[PDB]
mmCIF file of C-alpha atoms and ligand atoms in Angstrom:
data_model
loop_
_atom_site.group_PDB
_atom_site.id
_atom_site.type_symbol
_atom_site.label_atom_id
_atom_site.label_comp_id
_atom_site.label_asym_id
_atom_site.label_seq_id
_atom_site.Cartn_x
_atom_site.Cartn_y
_atom_site.Cartn_z
ATOM 1 C CA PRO S 1 26.277 9.594 16.381
ATOM 2 C CA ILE S 2 26.350 9.534 12.717
ATOM 3 C CA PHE S 3 22.826 8.425 12.469
ATOM 4 C CA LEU S 4 21.201 11.497 14.231
ATOM 5 C CA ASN S 5 23.529 13.873 12.510
ATOM 6 C CA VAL S 6 22.043 12.586 9.196
ATOM 7 C CA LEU S 7 18.402 12.967 10.247
ATOM 8 C CA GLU S 8 18.850 16.516 11.304
ATOM 9 C CA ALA S 9 20.922 17.503 8.263
ATOM 10 C CA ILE S 10 18.231 16.046 5.861
ATOM 11 C CA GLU S 11 15.075 17.202 7.514
ATOM 12 C CA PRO S 12 12.952 19.178 5.095
ATOM 13 C CA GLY S 13 12.461 22.867 5.856
ATOM 14 C CA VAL S 14 9.262 24.871 5.374
ATOM 15 C CA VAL S 15 6.698 23.986 2.800
ATOM 16 C CA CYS S 16 4.016 26.508 1.773
ATOM 17 C CA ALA S 17 0.570 25.329 0.449
ATOM 18 C CA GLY S 18 -0.035 28.511 -1.863
ATOM 19 C CA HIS S 19 -3.347 29.005 -0.152
ATOM 20 C CA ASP S 20 -5.182 32.183 -1.032
ATOM 21 C CA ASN S 21 -6.138 33.247 2.359
ATOM 22 C CA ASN S 22 -8.333 36.088 1.094
ATOM 23 C CA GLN S 23 -10.998 33.758 -0.394
ATOM 24 C CA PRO S 24 -13.551 32.730 1.974
ATOM 25 C CA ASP S 25 -13.014 29.278 3.694
ATOM 26 C CA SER S 26 -14.806 26.882 1.366
ATOM 27 C CA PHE S 27 -14.703 23.075 1.364
ATOM 28 C CA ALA S 28 -13.472 23.264 -2.422
ATOM 29 C CA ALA S 29 -10.682 25.939 -1.759
ATOM 30 C CA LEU S 30 -9.413 24.269 1.642
ATOM 31 C CA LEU S 31 -9.409 20.861 0.083
ATOM 32 C CA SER S 32 -7.722 21.885 -3.182
ATOM 33 C CA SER S 33 -4.906 23.932 -1.274
ATOM 34 C CA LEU S 34 -4.374 20.875 1.064
ATOM 35 C CA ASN S 35 -4.191 18.620 -2.036
ATOM 36 C CA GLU S 36 -1.559 21.019 -3.470
ATOM 37 C CA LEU S 37 0.243 20.879 -0.002
ATOM 38 C CA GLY S 38 0.437 17.228 -0.463
ATOM 39 C CA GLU S 39 1.875 17.208 -4.042
ATOM 40 C CA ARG S 40 4.710 19.718 -2.807
ATOM 41 C CA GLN S 41 5.378 17.855 0.357
ATOM 42 C CA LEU S 42 5.548 14.576 -1.768
ATOM 43 C CA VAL S 43 8.651 16.195 -3.576
ATOM 44 C CA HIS S 44 10.417 16.765 -0.253
ATOM 45 C CA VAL S 45 9.433 13.420 1.218
ATOM 46 C CA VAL S 46 10.959 11.920 -2.001
ATOM 47 C CA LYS S 47 14.239 13.891 -1.621
ATOM 48 C CA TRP S 48 14.476 13.342 2.243
ATOM 49 C CA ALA S 49 13.930 9.545 1.763
ATOM 50 C CA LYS S 50 16.724 9.015 -0.811
ATOM 51 C CA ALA S 51 19.153 10.723 1.621
ATOM 52 C CA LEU S 52 18.149 8.390 4.541
ATOM 53 C CA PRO S 53 20.883 5.951 5.906
ATOM 54 C CA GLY S 54 20.605 2.578 4.194
ATOM 55 C CA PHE S 55 17.652 3.486 2.046
ATOM 56 C CA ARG S 56 19.409 2.969 -1.329
ATOM 57 C CA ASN S 57 19.834 -0.679 -0.072
ATOM 58 C CA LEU S 58 16.236 -1.392 -1.091
ATOM 59 C CA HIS S 59 15.436 -2.563 -4.518
ATOM 60 C CA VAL S 60 14.258 0.638 -6.412
ATOM 61 C CA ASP S 61 10.651 -0.448 -6.596
ATOM 62 C CA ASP S 62 10.646 -1.060 -2.887
ATOM 63 C CA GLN S 63 11.999 2.420 -2.418
ATOM 64 C CA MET S 64 9.200 3.755 -4.249
ATOM 65 C CA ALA S 65 6.446 1.466 -3.007
ATOM 66 C CA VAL S 66 7.347 2.263 0.561
ATOM 67 C CA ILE S 67 7.135 5.932 -0.225
ATOM 68 C CA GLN S 68 3.729 5.707 -2.030
ATOM 69 C CA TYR S 69 2.344 3.754 0.857
ATOM 70 C CA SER S 70 3.550 5.617 3.953
ATOM 71 C CA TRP S 71 3.373 9.473 2.907
ATOM 72 C CA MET S 72 0.212 10.051 4.700
ATOM 73 C CA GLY S 73 1.448 8.863 8.057
ATOM 74 C CA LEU S 74 4.810 10.655 7.473
ATOM 75 C CA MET S 75 3.136 13.942 6.666
ATOM 76 C CA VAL S 76 0.626 13.692 9.422
ATOM 77 C CA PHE S 77 3.274 12.925 12.097
ATOM 78 C CA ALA S 78 5.355 15.925 10.903
ATOM 79 C CA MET S 79 2.400 18.261 10.796
ATOM 80 C CA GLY S 80 1.387 17.083 14.331
ATOM 81 C CA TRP S 81 5.026 18.208 15.302
ATOM 82 C CA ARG S 82 4.795 21.601 13.554
ATOM 83 C CA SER S 83 1.508 22.093 15.315
ATOM 84 C CA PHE S 84 2.797 21.368 18.534
ATOM 85 C CA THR S 85 5.928 23.427 18.200
ATOM 86 C CA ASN S 86 4.239 26.343 16.477
ATOM 87 C CA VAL S 87 0.896 26.796 18.053
ATOM 88 C CA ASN S 88 1.165 24.510 20.932
ATOM 89 C CA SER S 89 -1.427 22.100 19.313
ATOM 90 C CA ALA S 90 -4.159 24.691 19.452
ATOM 91 C CA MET S 91 -4.500 24.684 15.632
ATOM 92 C CA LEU S 92 -3.412 22.191 12.998
ATOM 93 C CA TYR S 93 -0.292 23.881 11.227
ATOM 94 C CA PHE S 94 -0.405 22.304 7.823
ATOM 95 C CA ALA S 95 1.688 25.213 6.514
ATOM 96 C CA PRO S 96 2.425 28.804 7.407
ATOM 97 C CA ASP S 97 0.082 29.981 4.857
ATOM 98 C CA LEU S 98 -2.463 27.099 5.817
ATOM 99 C CA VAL S 99 -3.303 26.915 9.576
ATOM 100 C CA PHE S 100 -6.545 25.236 10.531
ATOM 101 C CA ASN S 101 -8.766 26.678 13.186
ATOM 102 C CA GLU S 102 -12.070 24.978 14.436
ATOM 103 C CA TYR S 103 -13.893 26.729 11.818
ATOM 104 C CA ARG S 104 -11.779 25.330 9.177
ATOM 105 C CA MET S 105 -11.675 21.865 10.642
ATOM 106 C CA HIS S 106 -15.446 22.199 10.314
ATOM 107 C CA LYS S 107 -15.496 23.656 6.804
ATOM 108 C CA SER S 108 -13.162 20.914 5.427
ATOM 109 C CA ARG S 109 -15.770 18.307 6.377
ATOM 110 C CA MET S 110 -12.864 16.330 7.990
ATOM 111 C CA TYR S 111 -13.491 17.532 11.603
ATOM 112 C CA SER S 112 -13.348 14.217 13.357
ATOM 113 C CA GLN S 113 -10.057 13.281 11.355
ATOM 114 C CA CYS S 114 -9.022 16.674 12.352
ATOM 115 C CA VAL S 115 -9.700 16.098 16.223
ATOM 116 C CA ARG S 116 -7.583 12.982 15.891
ATOM 117 C CA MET S 117 -4.557 14.803 14.418
ATOM 118 C CA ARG S 118 -4.941 17.674 16.997
ATOM 119 C CA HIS S 119 -4.991 14.775 19.753
ATOM 120 C CA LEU S 120 -1.749 13.410 18.090
ATOM 121 C CA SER S 121 -0.253 16.799 18.135
ATOM 122 C CA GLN S 122 -1.135 17.142 21.900
ATOM 123 C CA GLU S 123 0.591 13.829 22.405
ATOM 124 C CA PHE S 124 3.964 15.381 21.613
ATOM 125 C CA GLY S 125 3.338 17.782 24.354
ATOM 126 C CA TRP S 126 1.936 15.343 27.011
ATOM 127 C CA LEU S 127 4.834 12.825 26.366
ATOM 128 C CA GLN S 128 7.568 15.548 26.373
ATOM 129 C CA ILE S 129 8.799 14.207 22.944
ATOM 130 C CA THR S 130 12.164 15.612 22.071
ATOM 131 C CA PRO S 131 13.306 16.878 18.543
ATOM 132 C CA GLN S 132 15.587 13.662 18.265
ATOM 133 C CA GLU S 133 12.926 11.276 19.269
ATOM 134 C CA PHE S 134 10.589 13.082 16.717
ATOM 135 C CA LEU S 135 13.153 12.684 13.947
ATOM 136 C CA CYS S 136 13.711 8.922 14.640
ATOM 137 C CA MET S 137 10.053 8.063 14.882
ATOM 138 C CA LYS S 138 9.402 9.829 11.743
ATOM 139 C CA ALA S 139 12.010 7.876 9.853
ATOM 140 C CA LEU S 140 10.495 4.709 11.149
ATOM 141 C CA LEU S 141 7.077 5.601 9.796
ATOM 142 C CA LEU S 142 8.650 5.358 6.191
ATOM 143 C CA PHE S 143 9.112 1.523 7.047
ATOM 144 C CA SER S 144 5.897 1.066 8.658
ATOM 145 C CA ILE S 145 3.496 -0.038 5.898
ATOM 146 C CA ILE S 146 4.024 -2.941 3.292
ATOM 147 C CA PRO S 147 2.164 -5.324 1.101
ATOM 148 C CA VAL S 148 0.863 -8.284 2.877
ATOM 149 C CA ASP S 149 2.574 -10.470 0.097
ATOM 150 C CA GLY S 150 5.894 -8.839 1.052
ATOM 151 C CA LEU S 151 8.395 -6.641 -0.923
ATOM 152 C CA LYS S 152 10.607 -7.266 -3.798
ATOM 153 C CA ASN S 153 13.508 -7.748 -1.570
ATOM 154 C CA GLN S 154 11.961 -8.413 1.672
ATOM 155 C CA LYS S 155 15.185 -9.136 3.599
ATOM 156 C CA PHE S 156 16.751 -5.601 3.101
ATOM 157 C CA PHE S 157 13.576 -4.085 4.200
ATOM 158 C CA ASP S 158 13.471 -6.187 7.376
ATOM 159 C CA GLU S 159 17.076 -5.255 8.289
ATOM 160 C CA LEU S 160 16.751 -1.540 7.553
ATOM 161 C CA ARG S 161 13.535 -1.388 9.614
ATOM 162 C CA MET S 162 15.264 -3.244 12.465
ATOM 163 C CA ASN S 163 18.169 -0.971 12.379
ATOM 164 C CA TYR S 164 15.839 2.166 12.724
ATOM 165 C CA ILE S 165 14.035 0.445 15.751
ATOM 166 C CA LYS S 166 17.560 0.050 17.154
ATOM 167 C CA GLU S 167 18.285 3.641 16.562
ATOM 168 C CA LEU S 168 15.104 4.782 18.265
ATOM 169 C CA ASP S 169 15.709 2.682 21.267
ATOM 170 C CA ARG S 170 19.368 4.117 21.296
ATOM 171 C CA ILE S 171 18.379 7.728 21.368
ATOM 172 C CA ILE S 172 16.010 6.958 24.198
ATOM 173 C CA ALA S 173 18.959 5.531 26.180
ATOM 174 C CA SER S 174 11.978 2.995 33.588
ATOM 175 C CA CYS S 175 12.919 3.834 30.032
ATOM 176 C CA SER S 176 11.031 0.654 29.423
ATOM 177 C CA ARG S 177 7.580 2.666 29.709
ATOM 178 C CA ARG S 178 9.266 5.244 27.305
ATOM 179 C CA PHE S 179 9.613 2.768 24.353
ATOM 180 C CA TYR S 180 6.187 1.329 25.128
ATOM 181 C CA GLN S 181 4.806 4.845 24.894
ATOM 182 C CA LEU S 182 6.573 5.963 21.771
ATOM 183 C CA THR S 183 5.670 2.686 19.936
ATOM 184 C CA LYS S 184 2.126 3.072 20.970
ATOM 185 C CA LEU S 185 2.164 6.731 19.661
ATOM 186 C CA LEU S 186 3.709 5.406 16.440
ATOM 187 C CA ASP S 187 0.793 2.742 16.183
ATOM 188 C CA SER S 188 -1.775 5.498 16.798
ATOM 189 C CA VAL S 189 -0.535 7.430 13.474
ATOM 190 C CA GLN S 190 -2.024 4.309 11.568
ATOM 191 C CA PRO S 191 -5.752 4.642 12.106
ATOM 192 C CA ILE S 192 -5.602 8.378 11.530
ATOM 193 C CA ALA S 193 -3.738 7.765 8.236
ATOM 194 C CA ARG S 194 -6.354 5.115 7.570
ATOM 195 C CA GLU S 195 -9.045 7.367 7.909
ATOM 196 C CA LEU S 196 -7.516 10.026 5.837
ATOM 197 C CA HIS S 197 -6.896 7.596 2.894
ATOM 198 C CA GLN S 198 -10.618 6.352 3.115
ATOM 199 C CA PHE S 199 -11.600 10.078 3.113
ATOM 200 C CA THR S 200 -8.987 11.164 0.278
ATOM 201 C CA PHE S 201 -10.099 8.438 -1.893
ATOM 202 C CA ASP S 202 -13.804 8.977 -1.549
ATOM 203 C CA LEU S 203 -13.081 12.674 -2.249
ATOM 204 C CA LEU S 204 -11.099 11.935 -5.449
ATOM 205 C CA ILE S 205 -13.723 9.621 -6.800
ATOM 206 C CA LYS S 206 -16.370 12.335 -6.494
ATOM 207 C CA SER S 207 -13.957 15.452 -6.660
ATOM 208 C CA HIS S 208 -15.358 16.550 -10.326
ATOM 209 C CA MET S 209 -18.814 17.011 -8.501
ATOM 210 C CA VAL S 210 -17.286 19.104 -5.875
ATOM 211 C CA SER S 211 -14.702 21.049 -7.729
ATOM 212 C CA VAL S 212 -11.925 19.837 -5.822
ATOM 213 C CA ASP S 213 -8.449 19.740 -7.534
ATOM 214 C CA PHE S 214 -6.121 16.899 -7.130
ATOM 215 C CA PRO S 215 -2.731 17.546 -8.748
ATOM 216 C CA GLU S 216 -1.164 14.869 -10.847
ATOM 217 C CA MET S 217 0.864 12.684 -8.630
ATOM 218 C CA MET S 218 -1.657 12.843 -5.778
ATOM 219 C CA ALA S 219 -4.434 11.636 -8.271
ATOM 220 C CA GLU S 220 -2.341 8.805 -9.498
ATOM 221 C CA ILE S 221 -1.063 7.707 -6.084
ATOM 222 C CA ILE S 222 -4.669 7.948 -4.539
ATOM 223 C CA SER S 223 -6.096 5.946 -7.322
ATOM 224 C CA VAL S 224 -3.486 3.277 -7.890
ATOM 225 C CA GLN S 225 -1.602 2.739 -4.420
ATOM 226 C CA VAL S 226 -4.151 3.993 -1.983
ATOM 227 C CA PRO S 227 -6.878 1.402 -2.904
ATOM 228 C CA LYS S 228 -4.240 -1.489 -2.338
ATOM 229 C CA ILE S 229 -4.181 -0.263 1.302
ATOM 230 C CA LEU S 230 -8.131 0.176 1.457
ATOM 231 C CA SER S 231 -8.612 -3.200 -0.070
ATOM 232 C CA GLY S 232 -6.261 -4.922 2.468
ATOM 233 C CA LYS S 233 -3.372 -5.861 0.292
ATOM 234 C CA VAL S 234 -1.083 -3.534 1.971
ATOM 235 C CA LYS S 235 -1.175 -3.057 5.843
ATOM 236 C CA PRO S 236 0.543 -1.220 8.532
ATOM 237 C CA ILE S 237 3.219 -2.731 10.668
ATOM 238 C CA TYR S 238 1.971 -2.456 14.277
ATOM 239 C CA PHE S 239 4.100 -2.682 17.136
ATOM 240 C CA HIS S 240 1.440 -3.579 19.591
ATOM 241 C CA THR S 241 -1.435 -5.938 18.904
ATOM 242 C CA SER Q 1 3.763 6.577 -13.362
ATOM 243 C CA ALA Q 2 4.187 10.294 -12.643
ATOM 244 C CA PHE Q 3 5.752 9.141 -9.397
ATOM 245 C CA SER Q 4 8.424 6.686 -10.988
ATOM 246 C CA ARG Q 5 9.290 9.031 -13.734
ATOM 247 C CA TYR Q 6 9.873 11.745 -11.260
ATOM 248 C CA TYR Q 7 11.566 9.311 -8.784
ATOM 249 C CA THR Q 8 14.038 7.796 -11.324
HETATM 250 C C1 DHT E 301 -1.156 15.175 3.701
HETATM 251 C C2 DHT E 301 -1.916 16.429 4.016
HETATM 252 C C3 DHT E 301 -1.099 17.739 3.719
HETATM 253 C C4 DHT E 301 0.276 17.582 4.339
HETATM 254 C C5 DHT E 301 0.124 17.748 5.765
HETATM 255 O O1 DHT E 301 0.677 18.415 6.428
HETATM 256 C C6 DHT E 301 -0.938 16.697 6.350
HETATM 257 C C7 DHT E 301 -2.195 16.626 5.682
HETATM 258 C C8 DHT E 301 -3.128 15.567 6.165
HETATM 259 C C9 DHT E 301 -4.447 15.510 5.427
HETATM 260 C C10 DHT E 301 -4.237 15.327 3.792
HETATM 261 C C11 DHT E 301 -3.291 16.394 3.256
HETATM 262 C C12 DHT E 301 -3.153 16.253 1.734
HETATM 263 C C13 DHT E 301 -4.367 16.355 0.962
HETATM 264 C C14 DHT E 301 -5.495 15.361 1.563
HETATM 265 C C15 DHT E 301 -4.941 13.855 1.318
HETATM 266 C C16 DHT E 301 -6.885 15.423 1.118
HETATM 267 O O2 DHT E 301 -7.176 14.888 -0.066
HETATM 268 C C17 DHT E 301 -7.720 14.603 2.409
HETATM 269 C C18 DHT E 301 -6.668 14.376 3.497
HETATM 270 C C19 DHT E 301 -5.520 15.265 3.158
#
């Protein structure tokens, strides 16, 4: 169907972090290169999203709001997939030039968060997720977190998000457990993103003390948008309760 | 913002 054609056509390719793998693993080096991975993946997320079916239906500020709220889950989900398809979930495949082994999961001071992501990635295997189910699930994560007070044009958002749910059910089809399972997986992204939000926020606050570099858009998002989530003004949309 | 300027 046309819908899948589009998701496959617009899917972003390979994004390198620019990490200097000659330097020793340090918290500051590992964290700075991850921050730079984020800024570069943010650009691709933007161009991907604008090309999504119906997305231009949203008020422009909603378009931007939804991107600035959901990029963490989006990116974590896609990295989980990469990890699964590249290294069979043994390591976290942030980028071809930034692969976390256990030592790096430790050196990043994010080890428990990393364990959760590896667990996510393991799920793609355990559940035999297909490329198409991946692609549709990922699209939905863009419409998975909104302000508690609603969006500028809430109706267009609701209808878009409904359609993306419909598409995921479609490319699924006792088939009942499947959907239970995929929604469940989708929900599980949310707590992980939440921890990373808490983590990146704390990190930015103190980053001058730890010589961690935050690029420009990352700095501003993390300080302007991310606290609206941490303070509870913006919350994920959970399938299950 | 750096994001909105880039976006638009
Ligand atoms: C999105 C990134 C980088 C993009 C990706 O593949 C997933 C990964 C998850 C952890 C994020 C990281 C960007 C930089 C962050 C936000 C650090 O500040 C702390 C947690 C990091």
